RNA sequence: UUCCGUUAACGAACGAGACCUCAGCCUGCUAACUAGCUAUGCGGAGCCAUCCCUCCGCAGCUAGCUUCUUAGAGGGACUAUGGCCGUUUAGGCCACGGAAGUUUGAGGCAAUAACAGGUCUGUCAUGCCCUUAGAUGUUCUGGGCCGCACGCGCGCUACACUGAUGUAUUCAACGAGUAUAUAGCCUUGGCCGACAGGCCCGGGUAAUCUUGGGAAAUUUCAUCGUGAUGGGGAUAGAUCAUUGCAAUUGUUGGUCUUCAACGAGGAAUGCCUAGUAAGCGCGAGUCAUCAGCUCGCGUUGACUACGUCCCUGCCCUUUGUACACACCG
């Protein structure tokens, strides 16, 4: 009965990582992992999988629809989106305890990818073209 | 310190030494909780003072490049520039380009300068010790703004003005925009004392 | 010859929604036509 | 398939099939057109064509129902007008409407009931064909 | 005998429009009717931007007006008449119902 | 370093990076990169640019492409 | 010739300076865990940081 | 001026706070074919290929469907718990936990007393004065507000390689669509056209169509090579098309050509403390056409500080005054 459905969240990049009891996919709206495209910023996406394991993932695939935000903040969700995606498959399938050692990797490594960043973008106010920068100002 | 993780995934955090032990506490390097895939993490930092003491050194050391606004936020680039810069390092000397780094940050961070304070009620510049974590940002600052100088209207690229930077100041020799800058500092310190 | 439903103003007019209030007679009622000032 | 292979290796590798895949016919405006109003020059590429092609014969694979009207968007980029401030520009139709007409003679995509272009049946095959025979 | 007749809410009042909204549903649900709702619709929000002075000096300060506007429907599996005989409750003052035969 | 300017001068395509010079701008470092040899060497670019494809087809040495036409070079081995 | 002596900063003292840029602390010298005098540093320093110091006889005065 | 308290005062009123709005958590509730996963039916392809495995399109009594979206309800944080500090009071610093511990973030509202502050050119709001038919009334034609020796302010574009150009690649959010006349404001799709722009069939008074707004910087791959260069794009010549009743003192958008100053800017001086500065583009107002502006939006995303009263100012107390249109005395 395997299926998980777990999101993972950036400023507005939004992951929701289907998941069925598999062999080894993880694609992003059916794109291989091993893909994606900030080539630099490749690491962060394939960060949980170096942390768990590809043995971790042997009997489980992966299908990561993202929608919104930008390209840096995509990498940072599905960060979450697959570890998150994880502990929800292992707290409801394989045993409680066996996922206390899971997240203790995920969080002695970075604490950010099991909860979001709070941060958003300041309104603009009037006065300046900014959320705190102001209009030059001129004595004579 | 334990953890067979590395950056980019080629170079090893292991068997790297930070000697001078004032400023071992603010090179987050040697620790197994520093070891990051990527100088990239939009980490909280700044949050608090003294928070940034725990970013990895290979970060700070990015974020410093990305100035003079036609490169503010360009991170994406900016760590790109590491990546070629630590190839070059490993390529000229074949030792461990992280080494190298914290090495070129030990190597060139004033020890003194002179502030303006007033004893007896009256005001001048006179000399006073650093605070480690000055120090590095100080360290940082001047290799990133030597580097950042002479690859201007230069055919050398910027990963390479930055990368024999690096090697010449952690060599220490005098030829650094870090290294000339660091002792004109001192030796101004050192008059007004 | 657009003016202000209200006074016959051609200035500073508010053809936005199709109000044609100019933007004095607008803010002297704008409470009464509903647009709350919540922020 | 198309999917498992890089997005742009793959297209060098389609955009060297439509050359050697027999051949079709070829503008004789070709060779001067900079693709755009906001270009400062044409395509450097000699063969460029088959390369908007190429990149171009995966958009149908890879959606439903693009007009030109669109097409120009997907090619578009931002415009410097010198002194005043930059903006979006949208690039030209004419070359996207025949890279259309050329692989509708050929079999790739066909004109779209509803509205757009639309793949074919079998030119399915080929895009993902070619995209077997890539690293 | 049994039809696809879609009634539409909008109003200016959070509070005042569910009033009505809920009154529809627990009206036709006293009659087991095939009751589809609500579908809530993205809030529209009206909005005006003026500079607060009537003479264009001192520090040019802006008050944004707005209005927000709540969009509410309702299906209703009944006639031209059931629809009408639920339909006929005290509407709350503002609430504009504009019930229409879907397809 | 007028290494664009100097890509005809018939010194070049007779010998000059042909292992003319080239054996040793690499080894300075022992490997010094494309463009420590483009400026350690007073002349710049693009007469290397073709070369440095030019000594890799010759098989002497192996090369990099990236973003910012990062390019390097190695000496033996 | 002066030796660069190593010295730990025990306690903060307040912030002096015209413009307040200036931490007093103080400092605990390594060699002879025992000397405890006045010193003046820049930037951002709490306890437990380790203050290079180049000379040693230089010593701050009480709000100084 | 918020409290603990003090006390020739006692008890009250405003302001502050509370409050109100958006953002930050809710696998819990009401749901939802104008939002949408999930499964299954088929259909297309690849391929150990026959099935299975993968990507795809179309419909349903598929859901013990609501994770993702919308919008309602309410839940949640109170410095709650722990530690040190303190009249051990009010409160301070920290730490595990947590979405969240600067009142969590940002805004709205906001006292008394005043200023000869601005607005009679927003208002058939308005006292007094001026004119009132040969008009300072109205209406029409044309010109001017745009003129150019010069000084000033907010800005846009740059002075390049952390780049220009040409490929390929592809990720948002806030808003917007007045019978708009015989399609018409937003405009999809078809065709003509090198660009510009046309002709055609249409969709939408809108979570339904435009548009899930396929945004740019960015990311790749080449070309350029320290050269006022291919940086930069002022100036000007020729022509074409659109808006409008009309384009001249070029409305604007194209095409070719022309290729200026500018080599990081003296004395001075502005804004700014985390999704912030800075970079990038988008929408709305005006609007027939014109956005280098303003109001909003999202995208990438730091350096530094966690302080002081030194300069500029503000509040309270004490003190001096020959000041009271009040030290610009
Ligand atoms: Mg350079
Ligand atoms: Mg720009
Ligand atoms: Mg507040
Ligand atoms: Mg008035
Ligand atoms: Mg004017
Ligand atoms: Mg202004
Ligand atoms: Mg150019
Ligand atoms: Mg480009
Ligand atoms: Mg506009
Ligand atoms: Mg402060
Ligand atoms: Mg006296
Ligand atoms: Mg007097
Ligand atoms: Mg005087
Ligand atoms: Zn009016």
Known sequence: PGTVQCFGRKKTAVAVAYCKPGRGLIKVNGAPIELIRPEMLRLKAFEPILLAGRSRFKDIDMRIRVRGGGKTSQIYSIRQAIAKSLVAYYQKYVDEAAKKEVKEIFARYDRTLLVADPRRCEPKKFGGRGARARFQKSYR | PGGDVKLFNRWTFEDVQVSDISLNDYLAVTSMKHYTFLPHSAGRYSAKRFRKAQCPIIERLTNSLMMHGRNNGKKIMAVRIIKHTMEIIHLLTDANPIQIIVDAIINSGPREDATRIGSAGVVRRQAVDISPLRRVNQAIYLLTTGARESAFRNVKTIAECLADELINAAKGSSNSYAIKKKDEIERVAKANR | SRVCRVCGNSHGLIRKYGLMCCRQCFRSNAKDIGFIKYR | TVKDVNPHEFVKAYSAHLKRSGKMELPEWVDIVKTARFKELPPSDADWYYIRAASMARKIYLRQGIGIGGFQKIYGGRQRNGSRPPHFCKSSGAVSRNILQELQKMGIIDVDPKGGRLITSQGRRDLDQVAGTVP | VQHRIRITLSSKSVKNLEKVCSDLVKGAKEKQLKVKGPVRMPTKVLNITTRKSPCGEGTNTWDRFEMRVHKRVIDLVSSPDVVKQITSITIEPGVEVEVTISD | ?77 | DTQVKLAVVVKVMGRTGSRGQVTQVRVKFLDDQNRLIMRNVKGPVREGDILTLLESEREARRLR
């Open chain 6, 1 to 77: 370093g007028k290494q664009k300017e100097k890509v005809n001068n018939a010194v070049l395509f007779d010998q000059a990076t042909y292992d003319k010079l080239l054996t040793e701008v690499p080894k300075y470092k022992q490997i010094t990169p494309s463009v420590l040899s483009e400026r350690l060497r007073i002349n710049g670019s693009l007469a290397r640019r073709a070369i440095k494809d030019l000594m890799e087809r010759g098989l002497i040495r192996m090369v990099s492409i990236h973003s910012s036409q990062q390019i390097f070079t190695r000496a033996t081995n």
